[PDB]
């Protein structure tokens, strides 16, 4: 028993940091195969920042200018090239340390883990979500850029998110490993707005799911309730609507607790309408929803 | 900024985790050079869990007895010795993978990361504390006895804790890599009482600290409080003595904000009179003490 904020174990992603400097500037990469990843914001200087126009700032660059460096050892630039917002150094050395690896562009409401990295070493993990308005709540400071987020699936290493930047309002914003931004942010000092977001209706009732396994259950009441009464009160608290899908996700849970997904939502119906009373539920006096059905199975399971 | 529960990377443990069996027990064991430790409690079938006596249960085992295996190699069992809770079981082969590393017994108050381990092989990391006392609040299903903390400075691995036990109360008990328990644990199937827990009030100024570096400063208020009227409030809430030694601790802290120590008991000492009205701290609706003073000077200065 015993419910935390779990991550993957770091070590395949920890042999694939690299350190990528140009210029003046120095952050994190990537190591995969014979190509070292990194955020193209690597080629700016901070007059630059303002407005790049990332075509002609990467022109004046030539291979020889990016310094890849893993550990000791100095990388060989063999070619460059820019795909979406990340760089894509080609070097004359496969990573010896290389996983089994996928890039996978994940869905706002999923978790992955973070290897939070400062000059080509990693430093912490920790667990997050990607928000519904992809936006993640990370710990990042400067110099983490280029650290990455990823899943394990066996012996598969998904990588899913590279950190690009944090906004004026401390939200934290990055792409996939094709470059492509997660959200409407662009790589650029502007300031952007992140949007409303909302709480992940389905990791929040997966989290309730864990708190009954693990006896904390206070929380459950005489009451059960219908997918649009309950959807009425999640729109009342800005929560995603509960489809029958996220209900087919809660199955295994379900099946687990011998609690019927409508009755947990009437719990947390009278949560949302009630509040905690200052009690607490798995160690939190508030509601959590970064951990999804599949966090809780595995966390609840012991999968390797 | 941000702030999160951040664990150390587990790259440098994960190679040393290996699987001990003895019968029909199977557990997580640690290889560190030639010597394989584990929880000793592995030589028991559940007959003998009641009331064991190690001593004559090990003699009945003899080195072929122990199936050391690490990923798919199996390692030969050379000797075997009880110290304290613990096997030691030497192997003729030395972990290629073995980090720099020490032993350390942890004082209570302090956190380390966990990596849980099922069969050899590790699920997941997460960071923890050692309650004042001295259980701690993990995340442990069956199997994952074996199962090692540790902290990481600069490229050492100080091991700090094995898991051993969960309790019928849920907490997770556990001994040093020297076989001795933390708290007056013993390593049998009887009840056994943890004994009043307190909050680490040291730890809940650091997040505090933490807070404020991370913009979070509502609970500020235009007061100042004494250590000694400050203690009277810990006291009524369960909290630790604060002494001159924590609030020189938190210097670093207090030199980076610019706000006193003392001022900071001050809000700590109104919202602890007075709850947190809903309101939240870095996420949080209520006072986090798994943070130590040194864990907030390394994520919000970036220690690799
Ligand atoms: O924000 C930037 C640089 C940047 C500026 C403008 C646009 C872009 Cl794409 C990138 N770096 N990051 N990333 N996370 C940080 C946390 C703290 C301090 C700096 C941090
Ligand atoms: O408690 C035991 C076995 C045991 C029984 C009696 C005494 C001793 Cl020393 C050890 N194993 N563990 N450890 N954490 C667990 C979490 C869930 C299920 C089992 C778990």
């Known amino acids: 028993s015993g419910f935390r904020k779990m991550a993957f174990p770091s070590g395949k992603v920890e042999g694939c940091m690299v350190q990528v400097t140009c210029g ?17 914001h690597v080629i700016c200087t901070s007059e630059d920042m303002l407005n790049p126009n990332y075509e002609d700032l990467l022109i004046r660059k030539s291979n020889h200018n990016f310094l890849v460096q893993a550990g000791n050892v100095q990388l060989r630039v063999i070619g460059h090239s820019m795909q979406n917002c990340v760089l894509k150094l080609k070097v004359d050395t496969a990573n010896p340390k290389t996983p ?17 990295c400062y000059n080509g070493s990693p430093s912490g993990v920790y667990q997050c979500a990607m928000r519904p308005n992809f936006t993640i709540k990370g710990s990042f400071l400067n110099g983490s850029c280029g650290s990455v987020g990823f899943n394990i699936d066996y012996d598969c290493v998904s990588f899913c998110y590279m950190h690009h930047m944090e906004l004026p309002t401390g939200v934290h914003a990055g792409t996939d490993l094709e470059g492509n931004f997660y959200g409407p942010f662009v790589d650029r000092q502007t300031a952007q707005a992140a949007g409303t977001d909302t709480t992940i209706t389905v990791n929040v009732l997966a989290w309730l799911y864990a708190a009954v396994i693990n006896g904390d259950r206070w929380f459950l009441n005489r009451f059960t309730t219908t997918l649009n009464d309950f959807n009425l009160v999640a729109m009342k608290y800005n929560y995603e609507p509960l489809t029958q899908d996220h209900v087919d996700i809660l199955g295994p849970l379900s099946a687990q607790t011998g609690i019927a997904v409508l009755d947990m939502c009437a719990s947390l119906k009278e949560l949302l309408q009630n509040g905690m009373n200052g009690r607490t539920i798995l160690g939190s006096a508030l509601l959590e929803d970064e951990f999804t059905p599949f966090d809780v199975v595995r966390q609840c399971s012991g999968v390797t």
Chains 1, 2 share one sequence.
Do not use: E
């Open 24 to 40: 003046t500037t120095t952050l994190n990469g990537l190591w995969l195969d014979d190509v070292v990843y990194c955020p193209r």
């Open 100 to 116: 089994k690896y996928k890039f996978v562009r994940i869905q706002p409401g999923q978790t992955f883990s973070v290897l939070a």
